Design a protein around this ligand. Structure first.
Ligand code: 63K
Length: 225
């Protein structure tokens, strides 16, 4: 069963990277989606590396369309993962990768595997993780995308985040976030887990927002981040 399955550089020609083991080898191996990082048999090399570092790179010139497009690809990847009944537990821009085609692959799962500032409130309180808690995390990722990789809740110390949130607070709208995309993030952070959108609903809502843009709005980095 692990026979059909059979960090450092490598070749096969495909360029590659290399970092119970056999069981999860098989499990990781059957997750095939273009917005999900593959097991080659050893993972494909991602030319552009992590999503967070890429958007922070002061020499890159992402547009609003570009950033929303990355968020759309994450959502497609998570829609697939969620269909397989798998919970990520650590969705963050740091855990998403970008290839030579600028295709986003959700990574940091399986063999490649507390992120308190990305955690839903019920997970901060129960230490249990669901698909609905991934959705909350996804909303924080979108906020990362729109601020070009700013750290969330900058003046909040990890520990005190649950108290902060329980005062009635959320991340503020980034300067280059469209209003409808901020409403989407607010939905992802709905206080009741069951009221949060599914990943299928997020793919749908975000693809419509994405289609309204034409690549004319350059997103700049914030000085206070
Ligand atoms: O590094 C490059 N590309 C060059 C990047 N440069 C930088 C300077 O600008 C020019 C472009 N390709 C790579 N592919 C792969 C393929 C697999 C893996 S392991 C893995 N599995 N899940 C995850 C999830 C996240 C992270 C991660 C997090 C933070 C980081 F910082 C780097 C990697 N790793 N990870 C590593 C790499 S790294």
């Amino acid at each position: 069963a692990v026979q059909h399955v059979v960090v450092y550089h490598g070749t096969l020609k495909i360029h590659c990277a290399v970092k119970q083991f056999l069981t999860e080898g098989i499990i990781m191996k059957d997750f095939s989606h273009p917005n999900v990082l593959s097991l080659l048999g050893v993972l494909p090399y991602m030319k552009h590396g992590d999503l967070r570092n890429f958007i922070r790179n002061e020499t890159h010139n992402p547009t609003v369309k570009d950033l929303i497009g990355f968020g759309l690809q994450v959502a497609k990847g998570m829609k697939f993962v969620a269909s397989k009944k798998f919970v990520h537990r650590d969705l963050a821009a740091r855990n998403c990768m970008l290839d030579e085609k600028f295709t986003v692959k959700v990574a940091d799962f399986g063999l490649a595997r507390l992120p308190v500032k990305w955690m839903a409130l019920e997970s901060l309180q129960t230490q249990k993780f669901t698909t609905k808690s991934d959705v909350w995390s996804f909303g924080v990722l979108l906020w990362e995308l729109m601020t070009r990789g700013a750290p969330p809740y900058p003046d909040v110390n990890t520990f005190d985040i649950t108290v902060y949130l329980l005062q009635g607070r959320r991340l503020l709208q980034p300067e280059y976030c469209p209003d409808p995309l901020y409403e989407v993030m607010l939905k992802c952070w709905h206080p009741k887990a069951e009221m949060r959108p599914s990943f299928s609903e997020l793919v749908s809502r975000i693809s419509a927002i994405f289609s309204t843009f034409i690549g004319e709005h350059y997103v700049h980095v914030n000085a206070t981040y």
